[PDB]
Subunit: 117 residues, 2 copies
């Protein structure tokens, strides 16, 4: 499965951490308007799922959900990450690098991707 | 200032707690499809802001952001609650009653509404 991981200036560092953590189990593209570019690539099949990382995750979640056909979930715990897939069928999850820590972030990415696939 | 508070079946209990917490400092309407109706009532000026509560907060956040002109933020900490107002100018915040506890939820509501108004 193809997973895009992207971060703005605030979230680029955690995005790289997440990309490296996922690279052995998924085909990861670390591709750090951002929500628009990544959402369009999910819609046209370039990626199956995406993880967008900013300061809080709020702005990218709003912007991604404004793309028709995109469902984006801000996920800051592993239960919500699983529900984002099983209940909301989100293609995109978002996180805030200034809000949660890197080890929790990795468990959230893993929990979402294990359920959506 | 007029604040709608609404929950689905999973969020109704926490919505009532939040409405009771806020109703002395704001003109609170406790309501409890739901996302769209409340978001539209915020958009048309019936309410100034809204707090939507469901199981995780994700579904009501998705639905509200798909109303043109509405910005909705899932806020599970007080920092993000202040950012929802100050950075994203969100009219709506959402919470998950199965995810956070009621005392943290009250502080989140208070932190959002303190910044979104003057």
């Amino acid at each position: 499965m193809k997973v895009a991981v992207a971060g703005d200036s605030a979230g680029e560092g955690l995005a790289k951490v997440l990309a490296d953590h996922l690279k052995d189990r998924f085909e990861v593209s670390e591709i750090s308007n951002l929500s628009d570019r990544v959402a369009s690539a999910v819609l046209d099949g370039t990626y199956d799922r995406a993880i967008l990382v900013c300061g809080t995750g709020i702005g990218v979640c709003i912007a991604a959900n404004k793309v028709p056909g995109i469902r984006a979930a801000l996920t800051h715990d592993t239960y919500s990450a699983e529900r984002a897939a099983l209940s909301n069928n989100a293609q995109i999850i978002t996180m805030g690098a200034r809000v949660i820590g890197a080890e929790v972030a990795k468990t959230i990415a893993d929990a979402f991707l294990a359920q959506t696939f």
